[PDB]
Amino acid sequence: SDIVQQQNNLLRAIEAQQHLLQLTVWGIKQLQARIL
C-alpha cells in the first residue's frame, strides 16, 4: 500500500515535470523563430 503510494507520488512529480518541459519547449521555439 505504501509502495503503490510512492508510485502515485512519482507519477504526480512526472506530470508536473512535463508541464515544465512543455513550457521550456515553448520558450525555445519562440526564440528559435525570432533568430533563425
Binding site: D2, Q5, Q6, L10, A13, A16, Q17, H19, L23
Partner: protein
C-alpha cells in the same frame, strides 16, 4: 513571456512539494524494511 515566467514558478513550486512528499514516503518505506 510574463505569463510563461509565472507558470514556470508555479510548477517549480508544485514539483518541489511532490519531491518532498516522495522523499518522506521513501524514508518511511526504507524504515519498515529495517
Amino acid at each position: 513571456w510574463l505569463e510563461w515566467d509565472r507558470k514556470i514558478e508555479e510548477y517549480t513550486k508544485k514539483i518541489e512539494e511532490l519531491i518532498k512528499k516522495s522523499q518522506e514516503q521513501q524514508e518511511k518505506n526504507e524504515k519498515e524494511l529495517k
